[PDB]
Design an enzyme around this catalytic site. Structure first.
Site, mmCIF file in Angstrom:
data_model
loop_
_atom_site.group_PDB
_atom_site.id
_atom_site.type_symbol
_atom_site.label_atom_id
_atom_site.label_comp_id
_atom_site.label_asym_id
_atom_site.label_seq_id
_atom_site.Cartn_x
_atom_site.Cartn_y
_atom_site.Cartn_z
ATOM 1 N N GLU A 35 50.367 36.432 36.629
ATOM 2 C CA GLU A 35 51.663 36.769 37.235
ATOM 3 C C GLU A 35 51.769 38.251 37.537
ATOM 4 O O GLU A 35 52.297 38.643 38.570
ATOM 5 C CB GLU A 35 52.785 36.346 36.293
ATOM 6 C CG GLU A 35 52.983 34.795 36.265
ATOM 7 C CD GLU A 35 53.448 34.151 37.623
ATOM 8 O OE1 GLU A 35 53.802 34.954 38.591
ATOM 9 O OE2 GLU A 35 53.419 32.883 37.837
ATOM 10 N N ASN A 46 60.136 37.414 47.212
ATOM 11 C CA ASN A 46 59.880 36.057 47.668
ATOM 12 C C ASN A 46 60.511 35.953 49.038
ATOM 13 O O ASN A 46 61.469 36.679 49.356
ATOM 14 C CB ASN A 46 60.530 35.095 46.712
ATOM 15 C CG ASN A 46 60.053 35.299 45.274
ATOM 16 O OD1 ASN A 46 58.857 35.327 45.066
ATOM 17 N ND2 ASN A 46 60.966 35.286 44.272
ATOM 18 N N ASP A 48 62.562 33.761 50.288
ATOM 19 C CA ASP A 48 63.980 33.410 50.273
ATOM 20 C C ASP A 48 64.927 34.586 49.934
ATOM 21 O O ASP A 48 66.108 34.353 49.820
ATOM 22 C CB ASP A 48 64.138 32.236 49.304
ATOM 23 C CG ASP A 48 64.030 32.592 47.831
ATOM 24 O OD1 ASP A 48 63.738 33.731 47.466
ATOM 25 O OD2 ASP A 48 64.148 31.663 46.972
ATOM 26 N N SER A 50 64.860 36.336 47.065
ATOM 27 C CA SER A 50 64.768 36.624 45.647
ATOM 28 C C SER A 50 63.564 37.496 45.342
ATOM 29 O O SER A 50 62.683 37.664 46.193
ATOM 30 C CB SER A 50 64.701 35.340 44.848
ATOM 31 O OG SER A 50 63.534 34.608 45.250
ATOM 32 N N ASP A 52 60.737 38.378 41.934
ATOM 33 C CA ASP A 52 60.214 38.089 40.599
ATOM 34 C C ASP A 52 60.005 39.349 39.807
ATOM 35 O O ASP A 52 59.508 40.330 40.360
ATOM 36 C CB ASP A 52 58.880 37.367 40.716
ATOM 37 C CG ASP A 52 58.984 36.121 41.496
ATOM 38 O OD1 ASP A 52 59.944 35.320 41.518
ATOM 39 O OD2 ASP A 52 58.078 36.035 42.293
ATOM 40 N N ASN A 59 62.186 34.861 38.186
ATOM 41 C CA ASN A 59 62.755 34.896 39.560
ATOM 42 C C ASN A 59 64.290 35.067 39.519
ATOM 43 O O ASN A 59 65.031 34.334 38.849
ATOM 44 C CB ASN A 59 62.360 33.595 40.225
ATOM 45 C CG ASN A 59 62.741 33.452 41.681
ATOM 46 O OD1 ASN A 59 63.369 34.291 42.291
ATOM 47 N ND2 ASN A 59 62.216 32.393 42.269
HETATM 48 C C1 LIG Z 1 56.939 32.853 46.900
HETATM 49 C C2 LIG Z 1 56.693 32.279 45.557
HETATM 50 O O1 LIG Z 1 56.155 31.176 45.430
HETATM 51 N N1 LIG Z 1 57.105 33.066 44.565
HETATM 52 C C3 LIG Z 1 56.973 32.713 43.162
HETATM 53 C C4 LIG Z 1 58.369 32.437 42.595
HETATM 54 O O2 LIG Z 1 58.824 31.202 43.175
HETATM 55 C C5 LIG Z 1 58.374 32.345 41.057
HETATM 56 O O3 LIG Z 1 59.577 31.773 40.638
HETATM 57 C C6 LIG Z 1 59.817 30.423 40.394
HETATM 58 O O4 LIG Z 1 60.574 30.104 41.517
HETATM 59 C C7 LIG Z 1 60.807 28.738 41.564
HETATM 60 C C8 LIG Z 1 61.387 28.408 42.950
HETATM 61 O O5 LIG Z 1 62.570 29.132 43.235
HETATM 62 C C9 LIG Z 1 61.687 28.327 40.355
HETATM 63 O O6 LIG Z 1 61.565 27.037 40.294
HETATM 64 C C10 LIG Z 1 62.764 26.261 40.325
HETATM 65 O O7 LIG Z 1 63.410 26.385 39.100
HETATM 66 C C11 LIG Z 1 64.605 25.699 38.910
HETATM 67 C C12 LIG Z 1 65.239 26.200 37.639
HETATM 68 O O8 LIG Z 1 64.600 25.733 36.430
HETATM 69 C C13 LIG Z 1 64.411 24.154 39.084
HETATM 70 O O9 LIG Z 1 65.652 23.627 38.825
HETATM 71 C C14 LIG Z 1 65.679 22.692 37.802
HETATM 72 O O10 LIG Z 1 64.909 21.599 38.198
HETATM 73 C C15 LIG Z 1 64.871 20.686 37.071
HETATM 74 C C16 LIG Z 1 63.785 19.657 37.319
HETATM 75 O O11 LIG Z 1 63.990 19.087 38.600
HETATM 76 C C17 LIG Z 1 66.274 20.126 36.813
HETATM 77 O O12 LIG Z 1 66.298 19.124 35.812
HETATM 78 C C18 LIG Z 1 67.199 21.279 36.387
HETATM 79 O O13 LIG Z 1 68.580 20.968 36.291
HETATM 80 C C19 LIG Z 1 67.113 22.349 37.484
HETATM 81 N N2 LIG Z 1 67.847 23.559 37.073
HETATM 82 C C20 LIG Z 1 68.769 24.181 37.835
HETATM 83 C C21 LIG Z 1 69.439 25.387 37.248
HETATM 84 O O14 LIG Z 1 69.066 23.877 38.986
HETATM 85 C C22 LIG Z 1 63.706 23.880 40.399
HETATM 86 O O15 LIG Z 1 63.444 22.457 40.451
HETATM 87 C C23 LIG Z 1 62.509 24.777 40.695
HETATM 88 N N3 LIG Z 1 62.153 24.752 42.113
HETATM 89 C C24 LIG Z 1 60.941 24.602 42.624
HETATM 90 C C25 LIG Z 1 60.760 24.602 44.158
HETATM 91 O O16 LIG Z 1 60.000 24.439 41.833
HETATM 92 C C26 LIG Z 1 61.105 28.748 38.968
HETATM 93 O O17 LIG Z 1 61.903 28.633 37.810
HETATM 94 C C27 LIG Z 1 60.649 30.170 39.154
HETATM 95 N N4 LIG Z 1 59.819 30.668 38.045
HETATM 96 C C28 LIG Z 1 60.098 31.697 37.258
HETATM 97 C C29 LIG Z 1 59.112 32.102 36.185
HETATM 98 O O18 LIG Z 1 61.130 32.328 37.405
HETATM 99 C C30 LIG Z 1 57.410 33.411 40.426
HETATM 100 C C31 LIG Z 1 57.069 33.158 38.970
HETATM 101 O O19 LIG Z 1 56.198 32.028 38.991
HETATM 102 O O20 LIG Z 1 56.129 33.614 41.079
HETATM 103 C C32 LIG Z 1 56.190 33.843 42.485
HETATM 104 O O21 LIG Z 1 54.901 33.962 43.079
#
Ligand SMILES: CC(=O)N[C@@H]1[C@@H](O)[C@H](O[C@@H]2O[C@H](CO)[C@@H](O[C@@H]3O[C@H](CO)[C@@H](O[C@@H]4O[C@H](CO)[C@@H](O)[C@H](O)[C@H]4NC(C)=O)[C@H](O)[C@H]3NC(C)=O)[C@H](O)[C@H]2NC(C)=O)[C@@H](CO)O[C@H]1O
Ligand SMILES: [Cl-]
Ligand SMILES: [Cl-]
Ligand SMILES: [Cl-]
Ligand SMILES: [Cl-]
Ligand code: NA
Length: 129
Positions: A35, A46, A48, A50, A52, A59
Site C-alpha cells: 500500500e 483516487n 472518484d 477521494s 488514500d 480511503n
Molecule cells: C483507485 C483505487 O482503486 N484506489 C484504492 C482505494 O480504492 C482504496 O480504498 C478502498 O476503496 C474502496 C472503494 O471505495 C473501499 O471499498 C468499499 O468499502 C465499503 C466500506 O466498507 C464497502 O461498503 C460496505 O460493503 C459491505 C459489503 O458489501 C456492506 O455490508 C457494508 O454495509 C458496506 N459499508 C458501508 C459503510 O457502506 C464497499 O462495498 C467497498 N467498495 C468496493 C468497490 O469495494 C475500501 O474500504 C477502501 N479501502 C481502504 C483500506 O480504505 C486504497 C486502499 O486499498 O487503495 C487504493 O489503490
C-alpha cells in the site's frame, strides 16, 4: 515515518492487528508494504476524488474526513491527516473497523493482489514478536 518491516510488525502487533479478524500479522505488514511502502505519510488520489492515507492507505470515501471528498463518510471518525502520523495508532484502529465491515482485507487492493493467498508469515520473519 518510513518503518522498517519488523518495526512495523511490532507496531501493528502492539496496537492489536495480529490475528485481528483472523488475519495474521504478516497479512497486515504485507498490505502496508505494498500500500504505502511502509510510509506513514503516503497519500494517493483516487479517480472518484477521494484519497488514500497512511501506512495502510485508508480511503477518505469511507473512513476519514479530508475536507475534499464530498458526499463521503468518515466511519473511523478521524481526520485523514491522523492516518499520516508516525504513530500508527489511528491507522490501526481504523484498519480494524475496515476489516470488520464485511469484505475483510479485500478492502486493501494491495492485500488482495500481493498478499492474499501468499506466504504472508514471511513478512514477520526474523522479527522479535
Ligand atoms: C483507485 C483505487 O482503486 N484506489 C484504492 C482505494 O480504492 C482504496 O480504498 C478502498 O476503496 C474502496 C472503494 O471505495 C473501499 O471499498 C468499499 O468499502 C465499503 C466500506 O466498507 C464497502 O461498503 C460496505 O460493503 C459491505 C459489503 O458489501 C456492506 O455490508 C457494508 O454495509 C458496506 N459499508 C458501508 C459503510 O457502506 C464497499 O462495498 C467497498 N467498495 C468496493 C468497490 O469495494 C475500501 O474500504 C477502501 N479501502 C481502504 C483500506 O480504505 C486504497 C486502499 O486499498 O487503495 C487504493 O489503490
Ligand atoms: Cl513497537
Ligand atoms: Cl506506532
Ligand atoms: Cl474475513
Ligand atoms: Cl503472519
Ligand atoms: Na470522508
Amino acid at each position: 515515518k518510513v518503518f522498517g518491516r519488523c518495526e512495523l510488525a511490532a507496531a501493528m502487533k502492539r496496537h492489536g492487528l495480529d490475528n485481528y479478524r483472523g488475519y495474521s500479522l504478516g497479512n497486515w505488514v504485507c498490505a502496508a508494504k505494498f500500500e504505502s511502502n511502509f510510509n506513514t505519510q503516503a497519500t494517493n488520489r483516487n479517480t472518484d476524488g477521494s484519497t488514500d492515507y497512511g501506512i495502510l492507505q485508508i480511503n477518505s470515501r469511507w473512513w476519514c474526513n479530508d475536507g475534499r471528498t464530498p458526499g463521503s463518510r468518515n466511519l473511523c471518525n478521524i481526520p485523514c491527516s491522523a492516518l499520516l502520523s508516525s504513530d500508527i495508532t489511528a491507522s490501526v484502529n481504523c484498519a480494524k473497523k475496515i476489516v470488520s465491515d464485511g469484505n475483510g482485507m479485500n478492502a486493501w487492493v494491495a492485500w488482495r493482489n500481493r498478499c492474499k493467498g501468499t506466504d504472508v508469515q514471511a513478512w514477520i520473519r526474523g522479527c522479535r514478536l
